[PDB]
Each structure stands twice: as structure tokens, then as C-alpha cells.
Amino acid sequence: QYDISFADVEKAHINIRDSIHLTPVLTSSILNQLTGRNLFFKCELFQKTGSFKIRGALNAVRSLVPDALERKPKAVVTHSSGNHGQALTYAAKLEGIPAYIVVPQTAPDCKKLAIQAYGASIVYCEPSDESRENVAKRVTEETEGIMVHPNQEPAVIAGQGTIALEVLNQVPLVDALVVPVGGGGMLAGIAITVKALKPSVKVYAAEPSNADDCYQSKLKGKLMPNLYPPETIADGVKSSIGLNTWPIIRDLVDDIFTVTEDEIKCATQLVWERMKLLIEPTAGVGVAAVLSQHFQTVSPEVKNICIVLSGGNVDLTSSITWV
Amino acid sequence: QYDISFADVEKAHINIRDSIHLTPVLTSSILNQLTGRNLFFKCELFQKTGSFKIRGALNAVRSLVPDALERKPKAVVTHSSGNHGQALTYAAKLEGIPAYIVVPQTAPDCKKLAIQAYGASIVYCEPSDESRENVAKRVTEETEGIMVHPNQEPAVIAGQGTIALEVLNQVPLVDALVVPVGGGGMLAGIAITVKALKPSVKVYAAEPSNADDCYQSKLKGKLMPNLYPPETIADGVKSSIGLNTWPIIRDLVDDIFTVTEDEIKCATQLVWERMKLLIEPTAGVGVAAVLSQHFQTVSPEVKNICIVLSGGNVDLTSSITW
Ligand SMILES: OCc1ccc(-n2cnc3ccccc32)cc1
Ligand SMILES: *Cc1c(COP(=O)(O)O)cnc(C)c1O
Ligand SMILES: *Cc1c(COP(=O)(O)O)cnc(C)c1O
Numbered sequence: 001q002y003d004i005s006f007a008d009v010e011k012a013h014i015n016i017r018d019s020i021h022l023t024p025v026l027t028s029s030i031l032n033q034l035t036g037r038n039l040f041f042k043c044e045l046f047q048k049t050g051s052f053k054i055r056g057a058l059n060a061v062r063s064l065v066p067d068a069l070e071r072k073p074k075a076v077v078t079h080s081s082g083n084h085g086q087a088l089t090y091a092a093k094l095e096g097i098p099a100y101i102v103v104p105q106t107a108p109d110c111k112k113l114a115i116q117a118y119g120a121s122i123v124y125c126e127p128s129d130e131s132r133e134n135v136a137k138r139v140t141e142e143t144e145g146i147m148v149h150p151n152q153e154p155a156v157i158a159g160q161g162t163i164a165l166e167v168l169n170q171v172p173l174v175d176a177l178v179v180p181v182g183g184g185g186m187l188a189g190i191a192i193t194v195k196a197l198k199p200s201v202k203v204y205a206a207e208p209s210n211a212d213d214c215y216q217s218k219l220k221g222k223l224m225p226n227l228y229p230p231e232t233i234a235d236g237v238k239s240s241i242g243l244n245t246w247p248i249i250r251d252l253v254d255d256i257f258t259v260t261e262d263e264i265k266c267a268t269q270l271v272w273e274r275m276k277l278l279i280e281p282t283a284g285v286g287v288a289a290v291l292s293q294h295f296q297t298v299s300p301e302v303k304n305i306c307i308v309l310s311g312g313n314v315d316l317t318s319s320i321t322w323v
Numbered sequence: 324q325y326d327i328s329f330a331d332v333e334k335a336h337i338n339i340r341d342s343i344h345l346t347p348v349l350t351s352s353i354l355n356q357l358t359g360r361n362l363f364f365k366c367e368l369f370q371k372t373g374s375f376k377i378r379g380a381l382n383a384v385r386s387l388v389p390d391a392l393e394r395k396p397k398a399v400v401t402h403s404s405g406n407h408g409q410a411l412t413y414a415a416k417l418e419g420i421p422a423y424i425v426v427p428q429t430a431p432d433c434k435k436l437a438i439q440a441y442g443a444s445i446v447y448c449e450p451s452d453e454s455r456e457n458v459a460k461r462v463t464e465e466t467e468g469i470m471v472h473p474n475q476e477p478a479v480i481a482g483q484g485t486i487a488l489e490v491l492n493q494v495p496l497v498d499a500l501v502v503p504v505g506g507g508g509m510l511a512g513i514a515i516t517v518k519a520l521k522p523s524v525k526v527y528a529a530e531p532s533n534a535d536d537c538y539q540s541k542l543k544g545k546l547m548p549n550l551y552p553p554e555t556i557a558d559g560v561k562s563s564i565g566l567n568t569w570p571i572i573r574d575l576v577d578d579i580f581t582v583t584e585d586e587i588k589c590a591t592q593l594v595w596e597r598m599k600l601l602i603e604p605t606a607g608v609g610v611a612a613v614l615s616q617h618f619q620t621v622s623p624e625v626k627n628i629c630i631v632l633s634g635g636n637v638d639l640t641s642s643i644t645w
């Protein structure tokens with residue numbers, strides 16, 4: 001039916017369990033006092049590499065083949081330089097294979113330094129997609145590597161879904177999961193998992209209003225990507241949903257809540273100050289969603305809500321700015 | 324025998340457990356690698372009010388009596404707008420009584436607004452130690468209230484001991500606790516508890532080398548307070564150890580590790596960046612201790628080490644400053 005099944009999520013958990021953390025679920029009376037609801041925080045900011053994306057990246061490294069004639073990937077390649085590229089590098093390192101990040105000439109020096117500091121090699125391209133594509137395909141082919149998309153690669157989607165296996169086991173009375181959405185790999189993996197195991201549990205997406213393609217797609221009933229690169233402090237959810245995650249999200253996600261830039265910032269600061277968790281602003285999106293006016297339309301029966309705190313890869317300098 | 328015994332810690336546990344968090348113990352692969360040890364981090368930064376101090380504060384509010392007919396305090400009065408005052412204020416809220424903070428009339432608006440944010444009621448005094456003390460005495464008496472010393476009050480030392488009761492359950496094979504020390508209420512409480520329950524477990528203190536009265540006292544065999552108020556980023560451990568906590572520390576604490584300012588700062592940033600826990604610098608003291616050269620020489624048999632991350636009440640502005 002979909003590009004992944006619950007069986008794929010379980011194969012992923014089996015494949016990755018020995019190398020990731022089964023992150024804790026923490027609580028806050030203050031947030032519980034504030035939102036009306038009984039909240040649980042799945043702490044993927046404590047995951048290896050600083051975000052959940054090690055789950056999908058490691059599953060892809062351990063499950064994908066480079067070719068019909070070779071079972072073992074000999075390198076990994078991606079155009080993503082943030083959390084995904086960091087996770088993919090670490091996964092490659094675990095498996096003893098090189099990682100290549102395709103980067104435009106125009107990337108900030110800080111981006112180039114950070115990639116080299118996570119242990120990946122940089123391959124330069126022009127800021128164009130013709131270039132980026134020529135370059136990554138050349139690298140993938142010449143290194144006998146796997147290209148690992150940050151959110152549309154089914155092995156990636158299947159790995160991110162393992163968050164929901166943990167949450168359901170950790171929070172048996174959970175009524176809903178709230179998940180920040182960019183490309184929708186985490187959303188879709190979690191929606192597959194929840195709806196396979198316990199479809200009475202709601203799956204809700206949280207998204208910046210400034211980058212609201214998942215909301216607009218669900219509103220319209222078809223895939224409507226951002227027409228232009230979005231501007232948001234939630235830097236990890238600037239991708240649009242794609243052709244592999246959209247059908248899952250259309251059919252299996254119960255609702256989308258959009259949140260303003262100010263809502264994201266206030267929710268981020270609230271978590272920093274009142275929970276003492278250094279979430280990245282992208283991980284504040286799900287918290288802003290549950291605090292938002294529109295989340296008041298959620299039935300009072302939906303009491304036990306687990307919010308995925310998806311990452312903690314924040315720079316203090318980038319902070320000082322917007323705080 | 325000391326100003327408390329383990330019996331007092333058990334009482335404090337029953338008194339407070341319904342109202343505080345049984346904070347988690349977390350771990351860090353990178354910090355295990357940097358130390359060579361199996362570290363466990365007791366996350367008192369997640370405790371109600373942002374530090375462990377609610378344990379001693381609540382125990383005191385629920386067990387001390389005012390100088391009045393009614394045996395229950397009708398208010399709490401404090402000089403502190405820090406972790407102690409915040410803890411006492413929350414304890415007062417739980418008990419449905421006002422908390423008053425005595426503030427010099429020349430306090431900045433910023434501080435006053437901040438004080439009122441956590442819900443304390445300001446009473447003004449004149450900016451001298453005489454007026455501060457006399458206003459607090461007056462307020463305490465007129466309100467039928469109580470005052471609670473931040474580290475030498477027996478009820479406070481006993482409540483802080485409850486940290487160790489939880490750690491010994493949460494980490495059954497623990498070999499050592501590392502505790503930041505200022506006035507030593509937390510250290511003394513923990514030492515009483517550990518030495519009562521599993522005395523083969525080591526109790527180590529950690530303090531800034533800029534405020535090294537605990538180290539000096541243990542070396543000399545006698546209480547040697549800081550000659551002058553110390554300068555340290557570790558704001559929460561500027562107090563010297565006192566007459567009530569010293570004998571406990573003298574007898575029941577295995578060793579003291581001192582750390583420089585730079586070590587404190589580096590350890591704090593390491594925890595922020597690698598553990599994603601917003602600890603205050605005072606809580607970075609114990610982490611710095613375990614990372615320090617002196618600690619590296621501790622016997623390898625002391626493998627499982629629980630560090631108390633004592634607080635997370637840090638101001639963003641001050642952090643930007645360093
Ligand atoms: O409120 C205290 C407070 C201090 C520091 C931060 N912070 C923001 N981005 C960061 C990156 C690394 C370390 C700390 C960081 C947040 C909050
Ligand atoms: C990548 C990322 C997301 C978004 O996941 P998608 O699968 O792209 O929807 C959310 N939070 C953080 C911290 C991320 O790094
Ligand atoms: C009060 C405090 C300490 C020190 O406790 P003492 O009992 O005074 O030694 C340590 N860390 C934090 C965060 C504190 O607030």
C-alpha cells in the first residue's frame with residue numbers, strides 16, 4: 001500500500017537498536033499546568049548525533065544496496081548538510097565506510113567547517129540542481145555508494161518510525177503523538193507505526209506557518225510543496241513533504257497545527273527555561289503546536305500527549321540573536 | 324552523632340516525596356569516554372524550582388514551627404532571591420502561606436520584577452546588614468512565620484539527603500557520588516545517607532579552587548572558612564561550610580576535588596553542548612571534578628560514579644557575558 005509498512009519499521013528497529021539510545025520520556029508540571037493536557041516529551045535531543053535522524057540514516061546504511069551486483073554500500077552520499085548529513089556521517093562511520101556531503105560553492109564557511117568536523121568529505125557543486133544532481137550521482141556511482149535522501153528514502157522513513165515503537169512502549173496510556181514536520185519522514189514513519197499498532201492513538205503534525213506546505217497539502221487534498229524556500233527559525237523543517245511521505249500523511253495523520261515564528265520562539269525558550277532541555281527551535285514547533293489556540297479544538301478525551309523533541313543541535317551564537 | 328542522622332533523612336523523604344520529582348538519572352557516552360568511568364547524572368536541574376533546594380526547603384516548611392501558639396508556620400521569610408529563596412517560595416505556595424523576601428529599598432527594578440515573577444512578596448529594608456536582619460526578624464514574628472537557613476538548618480540538611488536515597492535505588496551498583504559543596508547542606512545530607520546505607524560507596528565533594536574552604540578544612544582537620552567572600556562563576560557555592568555541616572563532612576566525606584574557573588566553564592559548556600542539559604555553572608562544578616586531572620588518578624575500582632547536577636537556574640544574559 002504505502003512506501004513502507006509496519007514490518008519495515010520493525011526491521012529498522014532490529015537493524016539499529018544496538019547503536020542508538022532508547023531516549024527517555026520526560027514530564028513537566030509547568031507545561032502540564034499550562035496546556036490543559038498531560039504531556040510526555042520523547043527526548044530525541046539526547047539521541048546519538050543530537051537528533052532522531054540517526055535512526056533513518058543507520059537503517060539506510062544497514063539495509064540499502066548500491067547496485068544489483070553488490071550487497072554492501074561502499075560509501076554514503078547526501079545533499080543534506082544539517083542533522084541528516086551529521087547522522088548519515090555517524091552511521092557511515094559505524095559501518096566503516098566513507099561519507100560524502102555534496103555542498104554548493106556558495107555554502108557558508110561555517111557550514112563547510114561543521115561538515116568536516118563531523119567526519120565527512122565535502123564534494124563541491126554549483127548552487128544549481130542540475131549541478132547538485134550531476135555531482136551527487138557522479139559521486140554515488142564512482143564510490144559505489146548509496147544516495148540517502150533525508151526524508152523520502154523508504155529505509156529512512158522506516159527508521160524514523162521506530163520513535164513511535166518506543167513511545168507506545170514507554171507511554172502505554174498515550175492518546176496522541178505530536179510530531180514536527182518538514183519532509184515528513186519522521187511524521188510518516190510514526191503515522192504508519194501508530195496506525196498499525198493502535199490506531200485509536202492520534203497522530204498530529206506541527207509545522208511553521210511560514211513553511212506550511214504540509215497544512216496546505218492536507219487542506220487541498222494533494223501535494224502542494226512550498227513554491228519558494230521558506231524563511232523560518234525552524235531550520236530543520238524547511239523541506240517540503242514529498243511523493244513518498246505525502247500519501248501516508250494524507251491518509252494516516254489526524255490533523256496539522258501551524259505555528260507562527262513568535263510561537264516557535266516562545267515555546268523554545270519555555271522549554272529551555274522551564275524544562276532545562278536545550279532543544280533546537282525546530283523541536284520547539286511541536287511544543288508551540290500544543291500551546292497554540294487551534295490545539296484547543298482537540299477533544300478533552302485526548303489527554304496524554306507525547307511531543308517528540310526531535311533535536312538539540314543548536315548554536316549558541318545563532319541563539320543570542322533571536323532571544 | 325551529628326545535627327542529623329539517617330532517621331531524619333527517612334522522615335524528610337516521607338515528608339516531601341508527594342510533592343517533589345524523583346528526578347531521572349541520565350548517562351552520556353562522550354563523558355564516559357572523557358573520564359574512563361561509567362557516569363550517571365542525577366538530574367536535580369529538573370527538580371521543582373530548578374534545583375535540589377526544594378527538598379530541604381519543603382522539609383523545613385513542613386517540620387519547623389513558628390514562635391506562636393499555632394504550630395504551623397503562617398508565612399516564610401527569606402533574604403534570598405536565588406535557588407534557596409525560590410525553593411522556599413515554592414514550598415510556601417504548596418502550603419498555602421505567603422513568602423516574603425526582604426529587599427533593600429535600592430534594589431534594581433529588574434531584580435524586583437524577577438522576584439515577583441516567582442511569586443515572593445517584597446518587604447523593603449534599608450541597605451545594611453543591620454536593617455536586613457531586623458526587618459526579617461520583625462516580619463517573621465509579626466506574620467507568625469519561619470526562616471530557614473540555606474545549609475545549616477537540620478531540616479534542610481536532612482531533606483537534601485533524600486537525593487542519595489534515590490540515587491542508591493536508581494544506581495544500585497554505584498561506587499561514588501560527586502557533590503558540589505558550598506555551605507555543605509547537600510554534601511552533609513548525602514554523606515549521612517550514603518554512610519548509613521552503603522558505606523563502601525565513596526562520597527566526594529567538588530568545589531571551586533577560588534572558594535576552597537572545604538578542601539582546606541579537610542586538609543587541616545578543622546573548619547577554615549573563606550577569609551573573604553569568594554569570586555566564582557559557581558554562584559551557588561560561595562558560602563563556606565558551617566558549624567553544623569563541618570563535623571559530618573570531616574568524618575563522612577572521602578575526598579574533596581577542587582576545580583579552576585576555566586574547568587568549571589569548560590565542563591558547563593560541555594554538558595550544554597554534548598548532553599543538551601541547561602545546567603547552571605555551579606552544577607558544572609561536579610562534572611569538572613570528574614574530568615579533572617586529580618580525579619583521573621582515583622582507583623579504577625571506583626567505576627560507577629553518580630554526579631549530582633544540582634541546578635539549572637541560569638540567566639541567559641549572564642551566560643552571554645562569559
Ligand atoms: O537560558 C539559559 C541558556 C543558555 C544557553 C542556551 N543555548 C542556546 N543555544 C546553545 C548552544 C549551545 C549551548 C547552549 C546554548 C540556551 C539557554
Ligand atoms: C529533520 C528534522 C525534523 C523533520 O523531520 P522530517 O522527516 O524532515 O519531517 C524535525 N526536527 C529536527 C530536529 C530535524 O532535524
Ligand atoms: C545551593 C546549591 C549548591 C550547594 O549546596 P550547599 O548545601 O550550599 O553546599 C549547589 N548547586 C546548586 C545549584 C545550588 O543551588
Ligand SMILES: [Ca+2]
Nearest residue numbers: 211212213214
Ligand atoms: Ca512544511
Ligand SMILES: [Ca+2]
Nearest residue numbers: 325326566567
Ligand atoms: Ca551541633
Ligand SMILES: [Ca+2]
Nearest residue numbers: 530534536537
Ligand atoms: Ca568551598
Ligand SMILES: [Mg+2]
Nearest residue numbers: 002003243244
Ligand atoms: Mg512512492
